[PDB]
Amino acid sequence: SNIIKQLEQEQMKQDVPSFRPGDTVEVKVWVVEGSKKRLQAFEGVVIAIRNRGLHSAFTVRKISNGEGVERVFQTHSPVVDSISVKRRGAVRKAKLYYLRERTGKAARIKERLN
Amino acid sequence: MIGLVGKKVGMTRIFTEDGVSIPVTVIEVEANRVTQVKDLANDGYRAIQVTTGAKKANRVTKPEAGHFAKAGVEAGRGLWEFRLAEGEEFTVGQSISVELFADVKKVDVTGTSKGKGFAGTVKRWNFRTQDATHGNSLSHRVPGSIGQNQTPGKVFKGKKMAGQMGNERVTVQSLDVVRVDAERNLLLVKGAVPGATGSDLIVKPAVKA
Amino acid sequence: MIQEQTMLNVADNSGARRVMCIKVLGGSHRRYAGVGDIIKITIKEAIPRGKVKKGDVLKAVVVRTKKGVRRPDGSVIRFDGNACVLLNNNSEQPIGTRIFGPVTRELRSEKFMKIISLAPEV
Amino acid sequence: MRHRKSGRQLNRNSSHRQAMFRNMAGSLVRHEIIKTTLPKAKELRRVVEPLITLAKTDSVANRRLAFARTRDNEIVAKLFNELGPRFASRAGGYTRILKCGFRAGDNAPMAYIELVDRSE
Amino acid sequence: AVQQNKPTRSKRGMRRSHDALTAVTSLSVDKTSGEKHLRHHITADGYYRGRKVIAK
RNA sequence: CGAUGUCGGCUCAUCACAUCCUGGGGCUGAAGUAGGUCCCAAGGGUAUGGCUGUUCGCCAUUUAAAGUGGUACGCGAGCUGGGUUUAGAACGUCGUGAGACAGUUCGGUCCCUAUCUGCCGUGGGCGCUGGAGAACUGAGGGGGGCUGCUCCUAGUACGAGAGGACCGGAGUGGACGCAUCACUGGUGUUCGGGUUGUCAUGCCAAUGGCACUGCCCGGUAGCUAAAUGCGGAAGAGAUAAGUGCUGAAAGCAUCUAAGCACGAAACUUGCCCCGAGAUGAGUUCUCCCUGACCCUUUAAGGGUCCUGAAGGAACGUUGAAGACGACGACGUUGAUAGGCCGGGUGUGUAAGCGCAGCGAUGCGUUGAGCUAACCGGUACUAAUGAACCGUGAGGCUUAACCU
RNA sequence: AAUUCCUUGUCGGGUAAGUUCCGACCUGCACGAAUGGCGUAAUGAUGGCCAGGCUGUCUCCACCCGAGACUCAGUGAAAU
RNA sequence: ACACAGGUGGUCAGGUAGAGAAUACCAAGGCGCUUGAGAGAACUCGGGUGAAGGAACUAGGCAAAAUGGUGCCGUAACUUC
């Protein structure tokens, strides 16, 4: 089959900013949150590589908020406007699941500058 | 009125705004080529043999080749005969496409389900397992006590037993169509339909009261 | 699974310090609870300024679970712990006067309007 | 189950299956013909051709491979230096296969694996 | 349990059709080989495609 | 009595009907909400924890109901052995005493290699009496059946207030079967990283084995679920007990005799599947076959010339086929499986060289390197030249057609 | 009470409830002082209850690697 | 009684890690277990991994699974100290 591979290419984005797990994305979002449409500024670090395409959940985690707060929006969805990607990380993993078994003050994500 | 034979190519989701995911099954339906129409100097009932396929020129056999020869030089692998109701068909007209669903978007689907070999005694028949310890051993997934003492004193029909399973016909009556494309041979339906990817099925416009 | 003998943390102010669930509620031969379910609960440790004691029996609403909230857009709204708010069976609503943190915005959607006015910023 | 795998179960532990292919390869590199059963031969073809391909790829870091296998002196002047050019002149293919008559003492189908450059 | 009576001589049915086998229809003749060979296969003197490919 | 396991559990179930729930009808000290309480109907439904082996009971708490009973108080060549129970101990009661005690408490090994019946799946042989390939009917056979919470109808009706309906819906949940693999989790011993100890490649490399898959973290493909979806309806026919209209034998009376108007989840239809071992072998289309003779008083054959297969079986390469049978895709009118060259997912910047540094170690070339199943190109490797099972238009009767 | 009909004495503790464990009271039908009365330390392949841990024991099972069962070959038993 | 997954008092005493005759990877030396060929089903069975709860199991914590070392700080009732 080919048409099942083309059906996703009319809802996926064709040119976008480049990002990887550990990057600061500064997502501007709508996410409903009331009856009239309004733009909010979401903070945190992206924990997604989104290579699987249309259904990639675009997971973001703010470790600077209390114990750490986590949310999803999807990579190709109508609830997100644009990402800045001005600041970018330098990590050695792509899933980052250790943030779900280690205390935040011992799991702060490394900058590893030389 | 009639039915179409297709090819189930997978499942996905197409969403709504701002959310709700709308899971959809993806089917390809190459236009059904037609082989025969009855009550036209052949048989006492109104019916069409819709056909899909062609087979291979050095593998096709004489009793099949000579059965399609009235309609052409390709053995269309099957007939799929449907009786006519609330409509008409003739021996001239375009090969039957998904334009059958251009305005009638509620359908019913027939096909074989769960083609998964033997499964297992508990994985098929949804039994309750025995104790894994507390002195119990050797029995855990065996079918159990198959009857009761003397008076009925026999094994019942309509009970649960092991064997070769699956690949038997199921009919689905509550389905809505999301999109069709006759130029790209596409059918998109809301939810799921019986059998794995590669399944042929039958899809029909709804006649349920 | 949140079911009989599941231990939950309270988001209720000056509330109980250790609490454990019994039965499940909401339907005949029902299986398991999650976000938006109300369950029957028992007190094991109350804290000295508690107005209940050990072996007192109440109800609580489940506001967070480690399994999260499903079906927004095909993804899942995730959380890390199982948490509840204890309810008053005689007067309805929470047993306290305020709630700890924003809890969950699912309480604003359709069914829990008398709770999100008591304290929650949602 | 085997519901995805295309390999063969052969006989005995997986650590022996892998070792027997590497032992038959450690003989084929110096005897250039091996006699065995059709299941053993069809899996072995996909173990010897990576080793004969490796003999063309004498580059940085890639030369680190297969050094811990067949650790004997009687092949070190043939592996890479000789086992490369004999097939780098052929631009594709390394092994010639044939399936042979069944064993009369048991029931296995036989096979013959030969190198495409063998001179007896 | 043991055989209480010797069966009617027909009851060996589907064992009797397997009691001695070739399991092939029907082996082929070759111009340079004495004993018959299997379809698409090598002879007892190493002939394949009418040419000798192995030695015994 | 030359043996027949008994109360309890787990698991697998079934019958009754004096009906607990559901569908209904009726009396009432039926105002309303309820209770008290009886009969039509057995299609469907009907309990968890603390103590106890508990049957039973005492309490705690759920629920559409927490109904009763049969079946050797169902199912130990079904598993278990908590209770009943010897062989050990000890307190009491009894006896001169050994010892006894259905006094009490504690403790106490459970054998198995399947004929015929029963039941699920699945072959060969034979039956359909000319053969081979596909599609289709219908003698019969099974499956299903709801239910909490709340508001609007309605705080209306009813009643001194409190309290609180028929009607007939609308939102939102539960249970149960069936379905997919889309989620999103689990699994993932043909892929990568982190790592301890020791052996190996002479030694340093970094590439391997063993140590629970040595330990840990991810993961493609495949699978799987604690995933996400739908439905038994409705529209009607006829009935139960029962309620009425008209009305009689019996000039009255009455729901029944004539007649017509209804009446439940039960009965019938509708709804889904199975069905030609259907000897009681139905139908429609395609492909294959229509010549003689010798020898013999012969539905018994033994030969010869003339002339025949449709398609299968075999061969494998293989499969999302499969216990074995049995079955599907394909093989030069050429992608069945592998091999090569690309694309992708996963893992995470390697190894050299270069540089900084006392060194461990790090940084640049480098989004590096490594790679499997995911899918695009390509016949690189293999499938080569014969036989076999299978003919001669298939006995007779009845009516009609054509000549 | 390893002694007692009524018994799950009975008040109270432990518990969502507790015939089970404890504190206590003493109608011990029929305890009791070297066939001793009764309690600690220390011990036990020792009795019972509560709580923290472990976790597919349980809730609801599913994949992953292997052995037998499955199909034969050679050799070929057992109770009935 | 078997060409039997069983038995048999003492003795010697390498390396790496180790307290060691524990334990593991190796050496020297020894051994490859005298059914062969295939398939990869129910059900049994040696094991690994598990969302998220958690003894809720059971007559009873019976098996699974965990605990587990070296050093310092710290350390209750009862006691013949």
Domain boundaries, chain B: 1-209
Say if the Cβ atoms of C75 and A72 lie within 8 Å.
Answer: yes
Residues 6+ apart with CB under 8 A from A95: A21, A47
Distance (Å) of CA B196 to CA B7, B26, B113, B163, B200: 10, 12, 8, 21, 10
Centroid of chain to Cα A61: 8
Per the rule left: phi > 0, alpha: psi between -120 and 50, beta: everything else, B194 is beta
Lookup: tokens for B115: 């083609």
Distance (Å) of CA A22 to CA A19, A86, A95, A109, B142: 9, 12, 10, 8, 52
**SS3 string of B67-93?**
HHCCCCCCCCCCCCEEECCCCCCCCCC
Total domain count, chain E: 1
* CA–CA separation, C112 and D4 (whole Å): 49
Contact by Cβ (8 Å): C79, C64: yes
Q: Which residues on adjacent β-strands are paired with residue E37?
A: E28
E strand or H helix that includes residue D3: none
D112: nearest CA partner in chain E: E54
Q: CA C45, C1' H69: Å apart? A: 37
Residue range(s) defining the domain that contains residue E31? 1-55
The overall longest dimension of chain C from CA atoms, in Å, is: 45
Distance (Å) of CA B180 to CA A5, B13, B43, B60, B63: 16, 16, 34, 33, 36
Mutate to test the interface with A, among C73, C107, C121 (most CBs of A within 10 A): C73
What was the structure determination method?
Answer: cryo-EM
Which positions in chain C touch A55 (Cβ < 8 Å)?
74
Residues 6+ apart with CB under 8 A from B52: B5, B6, B30, B32, B33, B76, B77, B78, B80
Interface of C with B in 52-91 (CB under 8 A): 71-74
Q: Which nucleotides of F are covered by protein (CB under 7 A)?
A: 9-14, 46, 48, 61-66, 70-72, 74-76, 78-81, 114-115, 118-125, 132-136, 142-143, 147-148, 172-185, 189-190, 193, 200-202, 205-210, 217-219, 221-231, 233-235, 270-274, 284-288, 310-323, 325, 330-334, 337-340, 344-352, 362-364, 367, 369-370, 373, 376, 380-388
Interface of D with E in 80-99 (CB under 8 A): 98-99
Lookup: tokens for B93: 């007209």
Which chains touch A (3+ CB pairs under 8 A)? B, C
Question: Could you tell me if E47 lies within 8 Å of chain D, comparing CB atoms?
Answer: no
Phi, psi at D39, each rounded to 5°: -60, -45
Which chains touch B (3+ CB pairs under 8 A)? A, C
Phi, psi at D54, each rounded to 5°: -50, -35
User: Tokens 């509840």 correspond to what residue?
Assistant: C84
- Burial-class residue B117 by CB neighbours within 10 Å (0-12, 13-18, 19+): exposed
Lookup: tokens for B25: 């099954």
Q: CA B131, C1' F110: Å apart? A: 18
Nearest nucleotide, CA B67 to C1': F286
* CA–CA separation, C33 and C60 (whole Å): 11
Q: Which nucleotides of G are covered by protein (CB under 7 A)?
A: 15-17, 56-67, 72-73, 79-80
Say if the Cβ atoms of A74 and C75 lie within 8 Å.
Answer: yes
Q: CA B197, C1' G80: Å apart? A: 55
Which positions in chain D touch E39 (Cβ < 8 Å)?
none
* CA–CA separation, D14 and D8 (whole Å): 11
Nearest nucleotide, CA B117 to C1': F322
Contact by Cβ (8 Å): B98, B169: no
Resolution value (Å, 1 decimal): 13.0
Contact by Cβ (8 Å): E48, D104: no
Distance (Å) of CA A59 to CA A27, A96, B200: 11, 11, 38
Which residue, D65, D64, D72, is CA-closest to D27?
A: D72
Which positions in chain A touch C78 (Cβ < 8 Å)?
70-72
Give the ranges where chain B is alpha helix by DSSP (H).
Answer: 62-68, 121-125
CA angle E3, E8, E11 (to 5 degrees): 85
Report helix, strand or coil for D87: helix
